[PDB]
Write an enzyme that holds these catalytic residues in place. Structure first.
Site, PDB file in Angstrom:
ATOM      1  N   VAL A   1      17.038  16.806   8.615  1.00 11.40           N
ATOM      2  CA  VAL A   1      18.370  17.367   8.792  1.00 11.40           C
ATOM      3  C   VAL A   1      19.366  16.390   8.243  1.00 11.40           C
ATOM      4  CG1 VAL A   1      20.058  18.213  10.474  1.00 11.40           C
ATOM      5  CG2 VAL A   1      17.604  18.613  10.851  1.00 11.40           C
ATOM      6  N   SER A  58       1.682   1.442  16.231  1.00  6.50           N
ATOM      7  CA  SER A  58       2.146   2.150  15.047  1.00  6.50           C
ATOM      8  C   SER A  58       0.989   2.978  14.469  1.00  6.50           C
ATOM      9  CB  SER A  58       2.760   1.200  14.062  1.00  6.50           C
ATOM     10  OG  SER A  58       1.825   0.204  13.625  1.00  6.50           O
ATOM     11  N   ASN A  76      17.115  12.044  12.056  1.00  5.13           N
ATOM     12  CA  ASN A  76      16.256  13.187  11.761  1.00  5.13           C
ATOM     13  C   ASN A  76      16.039  13.271  10.254  1.00  5.13           C
ATOM     14  OD1 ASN A  76      15.185  15.814  11.282  1.00  5.13           O
ATOM     15  ND2 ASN A  76      15.810  16.363  13.346  1.00  5.13           N
ATOM     16  N   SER A  96       3.687   2.977   8.109  1.00  4.99           N
ATOM     17  CA  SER A  96       3.353   2.006   7.082  1.00  4.99           C
ATOM     18  C   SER A  96       4.583   1.559   6.320  1.00  4.99           C
ATOM     19  CB  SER A  96       2.402   2.630   6.068  1.00  4.99           C
ATOM     20  OG  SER A  96       1.128   2.705   6.570  1.00  4.99           O
ATOM     21  N   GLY A  97       4.679   0.267   6.119  1.00  5.34           N
ATOM     22  CA  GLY A  97       5.788  -0.306   5.362  1.00  5.34           C
ATOM     23  C   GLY A  97       7.010  -0.644   6.195  1.00  5.34           C
ATOM     24  N   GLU A 143      19.091   7.191   8.208  1.00  4.67           N
ATOM     25  CA  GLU A 143      18.412   8.353   8.716  1.00  4.67           C
ATOM     26  C   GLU A 143      18.141   8.268  10.221  1.00  4.67           C
ATOM     27  OE1 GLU A 143      17.819  11.073   7.486  1.00  4.67           O
ATOM     28  OE2 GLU A 143      17.081  11.043   5.415  1.00  4.67           O
ATOM     29  N   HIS A 150       0.809  -1.189   0.000  1.00  8.38           N
ATOM     30  CA  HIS A 150       0.000   0.000   0.000  1.00  8.38           C
ATOM     31  C   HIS A 150       0.865   1.270   0.000  1.00  8.38           C
ATOM     32  CE1 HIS A 150       0.143   0.248   4.543  1.00  8.38           C
ATOM     33  NE2 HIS A 150       0.055   1.543   4.340  1.00  8.38           N
ATOM     34  N   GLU A 166      23.565   9.421   6.198  1.00  5.41           N
ATOM     35  CA  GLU A 166      22.565   9.084   5.184  1.00  5.41           C
ATOM     36  C   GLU A 166      23.193   8.505   3.923  1.00  5.41           C
ATOM     37  OE1 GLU A 166      22.947  12.196   6.565  1.00  5.41           O
ATOM     38  OE2 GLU A 166      20.987  12.738   7.442  1.00  5.41           O
ATOM     39  N   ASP A 222      -0.017  -7.554   1.766  1.00  7.20           N
ATOM     40  CA  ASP A 222       0.451  -6.167   1.781  1.00  7.20           C
ATOM     41  C   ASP A 222       1.973  -6.117   1.916  1.00  7.20           C
ATOM     42  OD1 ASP A 222       0.528  -3.419   1.719  1.00  7.20           O
ATOM     43  OD2 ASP A 222      -0.296  -3.177   3.772  1.00  7.20           O
ATOM     44  N   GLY A 250       2.120   6.764   8.536  1.00  5.74           N
ATOM     45  CA  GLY A 250       3.468   7.148   8.279  1.00  5.74           C
ATOM     46  C   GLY A 250       4.490   6.115   8.718  1.00  5.74           C
TER      47      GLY A 250
HETATM   48 CA   LIG Z   1      18.781  13.013   8.131  1.00  9.97          CA
END
Ligand SMILES: [Ca+2]
Length: 223
Positions: free
Chosen positions: A57, A172, A54, A177-178, A52, A40, A62, A84, A175
């Site tokens: 930022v 949960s 933040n 999701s997954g 990641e 989905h 990253e 799903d 956002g």
């Molecule tokens: Ca970051």
């Protein structure tokens, strides 16, 4: 994540953010080139963001890598959310290190009562709306199939399990999701759906990853 805690930067090294101009879903890195997420969460134009904490930022760990291909499960039904699950291939291999790492697939399904770690950048209020910048975590147990079905009559398939707290307050949310449900070092679940978030008698529903390992492996082997 409602009712959780701040994970700590890069303490969940397999957690990815899927970005299409903004974070929209989580995912889990399962090797240097592949991410597992929820069907989905499908959309074109995904950039996978690894390393990641933040998400607003650039902090130094990253890796931003565009997806080359997405594969929604052949049998995904968006009305029921059965099956799903989706796989995302990265255009280039991630560089794996302690802060960016894959998570193992299960060799066995997990049982009710197993403690797991659920994580993501989803809403931290039921509804209630507040989106965090840093990664949030929740420790939660898998619930029995019978309590899951009783909570959501007519909706729980053999490809889903419930996890969380029937009393409410800890779940949960949109956002997340997954994203991952990891139990004893194995990816057992994918954040899939629920009625609201953190509501009494409405636990989170998760894709049952152990049912999909053969499909995942054969898909990776030929793509
Ligand atoms: Ca970051």
């Amino acid at each position: 994540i409602v009712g959780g805690y701040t994970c700590g930067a890069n303490t969940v090294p397999y957690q990815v953010s899927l970005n299409s101009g903004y974070h929209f879903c989580g995912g889990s890195l399962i090797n240097s080139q592949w991410v597992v997420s929820a069907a989905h969460c499908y959309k074109s134009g995904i950039q996978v963001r690894l390393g990641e904490d933040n998400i607003n930022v650039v902090e130094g760990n990253e890796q931003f890598i565009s997806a080359s291909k997405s594969i929604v499960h052949p049998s995904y039904n968006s009305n029921t959310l059965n099956n799903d699950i989706m796989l995302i291939k990265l255009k280039s291999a991630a560089s794996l290190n302690s802060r960016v790492a894959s998570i193992s697939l299960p060799t066995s399904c997990a049982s009710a009562g197993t403690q797991c770690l659920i994580s993501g950048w989803g809403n931290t209020k039921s509804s209630g709306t507040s989106y965090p910048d840093v990664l949030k975590c929740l420790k939660a147990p898998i619930l029995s199939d019978s309590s899951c079905k009783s909570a959501y009559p007519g909706q729980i398939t053999s490809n889903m399990f419930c996890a969380g707290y029937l009393e409410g307050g800890k779940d949960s949310c949109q956002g997340d999701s997954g994203g991952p449900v990891v139990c004893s070092g194995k990816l057992q679940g994918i954040v899939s759906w629920g009625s609201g978030c953190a509501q009494k008698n409405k636990p989170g529903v998760y894709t049952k990853v152990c049912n999909y390992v053969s499909w995942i492996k054969q898909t990776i082997a030929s793509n």
